[PDB]
Enzyme design. Structure first.
Site, PDB file in Angstrom:
ATOM      1  N   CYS A 104       0.763  -0.845   0.039  1.00 34.37           N
ATOM      2  CA  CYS A 104      -0.097   0.221   0.055  1.00 34.37           C
ATOM      3  C   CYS A 104       0.487   1.651  -0.133  1.00 34.37           C
ATOM      4  CB  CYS A 104      -1.088  -0.108   1.393  1.00 34.37           C
ATOM      5  SG  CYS A 104      -1.907   1.916   1.231  1.00 34.37           S
ATOM      6  N   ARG A 107       0.148   4.772   2.867  1.00 34.59           N
ATOM      7  CA  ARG A 107      -0.226   4.383   4.558  1.00 34.59           C
ATOM      8  C   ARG A 107       0.013   5.944   5.463  1.00 34.59           C
ATOM      9  NH1 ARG A 107       3.813  -0.549   4.967  1.00 34.59           N
ATOM     10  NH2 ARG A 107       4.397   0.261   2.784  1.00 34.59           N
ATOM     11  N   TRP A 276      -9.604   5.630  -0.839  1.00 31.43           N
ATOM     12  CA  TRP A 276     -10.244   6.043  -2.067  1.00 31.43           C
ATOM     13  C   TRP A 276      -9.250   5.596  -3.090  1.00 31.43           C
ATOM     14  CZ3 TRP A 276      -9.675   9.467   1.999  1.00 31.43           C
ATOM     15  CH2 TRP A 276      -8.163   9.901   2.972  1.00 31.43           C
ATOM     16  N   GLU A 281      -4.617   3.297 -10.839  1.00 36.02           N
ATOM     17  CA  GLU A 281      -4.803   1.930 -10.402  1.00 36.02           C
ATOM     18  C   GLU A 281      -5.843   2.224 -11.603  1.00 36.02           C
ATOM     19  OE1 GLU A 281      -5.952   0.279  -6.264  1.00 36.02           O
ATOM     20  OE2 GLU A 281      -5.605   3.632  -6.285  1.00 36.02           O
TER      21      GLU A 281
HETATM   22  C1  HEM Z   1      -6.916   6.001   1.340  1.00 36.22           C
HETATM   23  C2  HEM Z   1      -5.963   5.826  -0.040  1.00 36.22           C
HETATM   24  C3  HEM Z   1      -5.386   4.690   0.345  1.00 36.22           C
HETATM   25  C4  HEM Z   1      -4.657   4.842  -1.429  1.00 36.22           C
HETATM   26  C5  HEM Z   1      -5.146   5.409  -2.308  1.00 36.22           C
HETATM   27  C6  HEM Z   1      -4.279   3.598  -1.742  1.00 36.22           C
HETATM   28  C7  HEM Z   1      -3.985   2.417  -2.580  1.00 36.22           C
HETATM   29  C8  HEM Z   1      -3.070   1.759  -2.841  1.00 36.22           C
HETATM   30  C9  HEM Z   1      -2.442   0.600  -3.749  1.00 36.22           C
HETATM   31  C10 HEM Z   1      -2.674   2.027  -5.585  1.00 36.22           C
HETATM   32  C11 HEM Z   1      -2.015   0.264  -3.641  1.00 36.22           C
HETATM   33  C12 HEM Z   1      -2.216  -0.889  -5.223  1.00 36.22           C
HETATM   34  C13 HEM Z   1      -3.383  -2.308  -5.209  1.00 36.22           C
HETATM   35  C14 HEM Z   1      -3.429  -2.928  -6.480  1.00 36.22           C
HETATM   36  O1  HEM Z   1      -2.442  -2.152  -7.492  1.00 36.22           O
HETATM   37  O2  HEM Z   1      -3.873  -2.999  -6.796  1.00 36.22           O
HETATM   38  C15 HEM Z   1      -2.496  -0.656  -2.757  1.00 36.22           C
HETATM   39  C16 HEM Z   1      -2.795  -2.033  -1.857  1.00 36.22           C
HETATM   40  C17 HEM Z   1      -3.046  -1.947  -0.849  1.00 36.22           C
HETATM   41  N1  HEM Z   1      -3.978  -1.111   0.302  1.00 36.22           N
HETATM   42 FE1  HEM Z   1      -4.290   0.449   0.306  1.00 36.22          FE
HETATM   43  N2  HEM Z   1      -4.977   2.702  -0.234  1.00 36.22           N
HETATM   44  C18 HEM Z   1      -5.046   4.040   0.905  1.00 36.22           C
HETATM   45  C19 HEM Z   1      -6.843   3.218   1.800  1.00 36.22           C
HETATM   46  C20 HEM Z   1      -6.327   1.514   2.519  1.00 36.22           C
HETATM   47  C21 HEM Z   1      -6.835   1.678   3.435  1.00 36.22           C
HETATM   48  C22 HEM Z   1      -7.861   2.211   3.687  1.00 36.22           C
HETATM   49  C23 HEM Z   1      -6.568   0.228   3.508  1.00 36.22           C
HETATM   50  C24 HEM Z   1      -7.216  -1.207   4.738  1.00 36.22           C
HETATM   51  C25 HEM Z   1      -7.539  -0.932   5.748  1.00 36.22           C
HETATM   52  C26 HEM Z   1      -5.416  -0.343   2.632  1.00 36.22           C
HETATM   53  C27 HEM Z   1      -5.046  -1.420   2.721  1.00 36.22           C
HETATM   54  C28 HEM Z   1      -4.782  -2.358   1.300  1.00 36.22           C
HETATM   55  C29 HEM Z   1      -3.669  -3.656   0.934  1.00 36.22           C
HETATM   56  C30 HEM Z   1      -4.200  -4.657   2.317  1.00 36.22           C
HETATM   57  C31 HEM Z   1      -3.408  -3.825   0.035  1.00 36.22           C
HETATM   58  C32 HEM Z   1      -2.829  -5.088  -0.658  1.00 36.22           C
HETATM   59  C33 HEM Z   1      -3.963  -4.728  -2.118  1.00 36.22           C
HETATM   60  C34 HEM Z   1      -3.644  -6.467  -2.493  1.00 36.22           C
HETATM   61  O3  HEM Z   1      -2.281  -7.043  -2.185  1.00 36.22           O
HETATM   62  O4  HEM Z   1      -4.327  -7.056  -3.019  1.00 36.22           O
HETATM   63  N3  HEM Z   1      -4.987   1.063   1.960  1.00 36.22           N
HETATM   64  N4  HEM Z   1      -3.420   0.900  -1.530  1.00 36.22           N
HETATM   65  C1  LIG Z   2      -8.956   0.383   0.315  1.00 36.56           C
HETATM   66  C2  LIG Z   2      -8.167   0.360  -0.640  1.00 36.56           C
HETATM   67  C3  LIG Z   2      -7.440   1.291  -1.806  1.00 36.56           C
HETATM   68  C4  LIG Z   2      -7.017   1.681  -2.988  1.00 36.56           C
HETATM   69  N1  LIG Z   2      -6.273   2.779  -4.063  1.00 36.56           N
HETATM   70  N2  LIG Z   2      -6.863   0.627  -4.049  1.00 36.56           N
HETATM   71  C5  LIG Z   2      -7.118  -0.770  -2.694  1.00 36.56           C
HETATM   72  C6  LIG Z   2      -6.527  -1.839  -4.291  1.00 36.56           C
HETATM   73  C7  LIG Z   2      -7.587  -1.949  -4.794  1.00 36.56           C
HETATM   74  C8  LIG Z   2      -7.853  -3.513  -5.810  1.00 36.56           C
HETATM   75  N3  LIG Z   2      -6.455  -4.263  -6.288  1.00 36.56           N
HETATM   76  C9  LIG Z   2      -6.452  -5.630  -5.592  1.00 36.56           C
HETATM   77  C10 LIG Z   2      -7.242  -4.241  -7.684  1.00 36.56           C
HETATM   78  C11 LIG Z   2      -7.548  -0.834  -1.520  1.00 36.56           C
HETATM   79 CL   LIG Z   3      -9.450  -1.222  -8.941  1.00 40.60          CL
END
Ligand code: HEM
Ligand SMILES: Cc1cc(N)nc(CCCN(C)C)c1
Ligand SMILES: [Cl-]
Ligand code: HEM
Ligand SMILES: C[C@H](O)[C@H](O)[C@H]1CNc2nc(N)[nH]c(=O)c2N1
Ligand SMILES: C[C@H](O)[C@H](O)[C@H]1CNc2nc(N)[nH]c(=O)c2N1
Ligand SMILES: Cc1cc(N)nc(CCCN(C)C)c1
Ligand SMILES: [Cl-]
Ligand SMILES: [Gd]
Ligand SMILES: [Gd]
Ligand SMILES: [Gd]
Ligand SMILES: [Zn+2]
Lengths: 400, 402
Positions: A104, A107, A276, A281
């Site tokens: 992520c 964070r 958000w 993405e």
């Molecule tokens: C608030 C704005 C947030 C943004 C801009 C953001 C952005 C991202 C992005 C771009 C990814 C890459 C995932 C992909 O390429 O499919 C990601 C992964 C991830 N995020 Fe965040 N995120 C946000 C909030 C959160 C929150 C609130 C949580 C959990 C409480 C979280 C937990 C995770 C997890 C677990 C992944 C791994 C997803 C996976 O491995 O499939 N994120 N995030």
């Molecule tokens: C909490 C959160 C925020 C964000 N911006 N993106 C994601 C993952 C989206 C799903 N991908 C695995 C395709 C999660």
């Molecule tokens: Cl998505």
């Protein structure tokens, strides 16, 4: 302790946090597997450690309430074979799992998380209402707010709470008289599960799928989302008037609904979290992956680009404008979204915060670096260290 | 054996070749260090030599033959006698090609079999070293129709120092520390620029001054050698539709020739073995010209493009970078100097992984170096899972000799 360099500035740090790494990763001295996507009284060991985390995080290690809480978890498992988290702890562990998510980039926001406690849930119809409070609260008319809803923790003998969809909002994927897919080809499988369980399929390329929610030991049940609750953004470009005509849309709320939350030895197989979007993405992966909507050549034809030679970089030009269209559209609809430059610059701020607070930060380079303009963002030039800390979000098998 | 998925198509393979990886990298099951740039007695010499000789005799379909054990015993007797051994010429050509083949951070390895090997293991002095290098530059450049080549200088041996080229590439631009605090020229090259001057070079004061060579013969200080301007082919940079771009005064050189890496073949070490191919346009367009700690031209170009640089969401950085890469490709094409764009290069690297899966059961690859620095997921390598490990023969990093 691993030495970590930033190649833009020439600055050096050491990751002492890597010492506490819990579950082993996939790499060995013999080979690196970092680029791969998917790599009984021990329950007290992890619970004890999580409890010590909580009290140190509130400067209450070695005091009365700390000692106290240790005994009652001890007694809870002795009598019942498991335990319940105090409300404050489930809050603290949800934030910590997000904090510890190496993939992520957002964070920097980990301390701002609204935690809904659905641990008294008891039916799929109850799930739907809880999910529906979440969506409407998280969406907030486009001023998105991070949220997670935590359904009951798994126990022996009894079935699991599970959401069958990978996200709360997914688009349909339909096969044809020629095999190929109309709609989102990622969700061809869940689309055919939903058609199975009673849903009459639409005909469009952007049909919001119905949910499949699973109460323990009962089969999944269809639930039709209220269309007034699924905020969507129609896609237009600021200066390419024909872009709107391509009929492209995406939804507002990114909410992963297939990962398993683990806190202090307890496992929650149903716990949707939402934030958000980062604009790459949608604009880069979802719309331009060849196995996704694969719109790249269609946009390039409309731009009258020369698609006959790779060295005109027509793919690159068309991709950049698709991302411009995503950002412009979400901003005009007043839906929270962040571009990959702003997102990565905040992540660098996060790393520096984490270095001072915890002595490092588990980061997964291949996923933090955005999928367009990689070396134009600062994370490209930042060495990172990847490892597993608890609490954590974990991948899990599919419930069929 | 690790299972490897291609996420674009669905393909699934298993890297059996990784099981043979003989040296250790930096990762453990606790932590991955894959993103770090620098992740690092007679019988041990004997066992690597044995392994290389086996590799060579496999390549010539003579495994387990008379000649095969003939060489194996020969090498041991020579190690026992001399403490080392000498490669036959054909063994050296095969070993240099395998080292390229084995290099996990090279995306142009579809070409690994087409390599011109110059044997300079008789080189006697720094002056002779220079002559061999000029001939390498001349042959490889080939008036813009570039040819891949490597020149191998004498191997390391007890009793005498190493041959070394102190420059990290045969062609490098100067980097002069300015009056305020800035660098004029290429900031990656401030150190070597300072070594050349302190070794009696007369510095220029341009942004694209080509550096002299610092050549070290064994147990000798390095000696300065100037490269004749007509041997160093360069490319003025222009943009096909942005006529103001030519006024930036930008150039790059035709030949990428890495000169500071160590070639290891069957236990023997060649600390001086410069090798060269041709550029992929992103190294120049994206990294060399757009990195903040390099020429750093991104903002100046975007201002000139009339982009709105005050907000990130206008994607001015992405747009300007794309045109800087266009300018690079167009300019090398105009000048008739070989160059490959990141879409063609990654698509041919996909064929290399396929070729290699059938030939050897896998292929060592460093995903973070293979995926280009712009438009990553628009290339097929982004969606390819990869296994990074160390095979020998190899090109290895080595410390600076100063
Ligand atoms: C608030 C704005 C947030 C943004 C801009 C953001 C952005 C991202 C992005 C771009 C990814 C890459 C995932 C992909 O390429 O499919 C990601 C992964 C991830 N995020 Fe965040 N995120 C946000 C909030 C959160 C929150 C609130 C949580 C959990 C409480 C979280 C937990 C995770 C997890 C677990 C992944 C791994 C997803 C996976 O491995 O499939 N994120 N995030
Ligand atoms: C909490 C959160 C925020 C964000 N911006 N993106 C994601 C993952 C989206 C799903 N991908 C695995 C395709 C999660
Ligand atoms: Cl998505
Ligand atoms: C013929 C066309 C070639 C192309 C298109 C090509 C492409 C590339 C690229 C883009 C890189 C990454 C470099 C960086 O980011 O600094 C690289 C690295 C490398 N290449 Fe190739 N290359 C070619 C020829 C060769 C040859 C002939 C050899 C050796 C005989 C070779 C060996 C290596 C090595 C060892 C590296 C890693 C360099 C380092 O780690 O600093 N390449 N190549
Ligand atoms: C093969 C490779 O690991 C895979 O395509 C990864 C690379 N990096 C990624 N990074 C993010 N953020 N999301 C992804 O899906 C991927 N895919
Ligand atoms: C910190 C990070 O590992 C570093 O910037 C790497 C990333 N990937 C790279 N990839 C290539 N081809 N060349 C490089 O110099 C780098 N640099
Ligand atoms: C032989 C070769 C070909 C190529 N295309 N690129 C390179 C790398 C140039 C230097 N980098 C290490 C900074 C080398
Ligand atoms: Cl270079
Ligand atoms: Gd038209
Ligand atoms: Gd023009
Ligand atoms: Gd200027
Ligand atoms: Zn690793």
């Amino acid at each position: 302790f691993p030495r970590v360099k930033n190649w833009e500035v020439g600055s050096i740090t050491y990751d002492t946090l890597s010492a506490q790494a819990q579950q082993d990763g996939p790499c060995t001295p013999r080979r690196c597997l970092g680029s791969l996507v998917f790599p009984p009284e021990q329950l007290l060991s992890q619970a004890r450690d999580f409890i010590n985390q909580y009290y140190s995080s509130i400067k209450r290690s070695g005091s009365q309430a700390h000692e106290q809480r240790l005994q009652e978890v001890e007694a809870e498992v002795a009598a019942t074979g498991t335990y319940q988290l105090r409300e404050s702890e489930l809050v603290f562990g949800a934030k910590q799992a997000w904090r510890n998510a190496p993939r992520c980039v957002g964070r920097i926001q980990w301390g701002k998380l609204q935690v809904f406690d659905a641990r008294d849930c008891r039916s799929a119809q109850e799930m739907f209402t809880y999910i529906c409070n979440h969506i409407k609260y998280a969406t907030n008319r486009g001023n998105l707010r991070s949220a997670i809803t935590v359904f009951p923790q798994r126990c022996p003998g009894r079935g699991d709470f599970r959401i069958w969809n990978s996200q709360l909002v997914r688009y349909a994927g339909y096969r044809q008289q020629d095999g190929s897919v109309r709609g989102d080809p990622a969700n061809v499988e869940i689309t055919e599960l939903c058609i199975q369980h009673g849903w009459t399929p639409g005909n469009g390329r952007f049909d919001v799928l119905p949910l499949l929610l699973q109460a323990p030991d009962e089969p999944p049940e269809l639930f039709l989302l209220p269309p007034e609750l699924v905020l969507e953004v129609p896609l237009e470009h600021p200066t390419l008037e024909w872009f709107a005509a391509l009929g492209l849309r995406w939804y507002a709320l990114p909410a992963v609904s297939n990962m398993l939350l683990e806190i202090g030895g307890l496992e929650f197989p149903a716990a949707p979290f939402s934030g958000w979007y980062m604009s790459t993405e949608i604009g880069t992966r979802n719309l331009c992956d060849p196995h996704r909507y694969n719109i790249l050549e269609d946009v390039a034809v409309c731009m009258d680009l020369d698609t006959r030679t790779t060295s005109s970089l027509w793919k690159d030009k068309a991709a950049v404008e698709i991302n411009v269209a995503v950002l412009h559209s979400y901003q005009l609809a007043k839906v929270t979204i962040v571009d990959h430059h702003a997102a990565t610059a905040s992540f660098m701020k996060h790393l520096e915060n984490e270095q001072k607070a915890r002595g490092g930060c588990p980061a997964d380079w291949a996923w933090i670096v955005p999928p367009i303009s990689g070396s134009l963002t600062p994370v490209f030039h930042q060495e990172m260290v990847n490892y597993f800390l608890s609490p954590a979000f974990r991948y899990q098998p599919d419930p069929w």
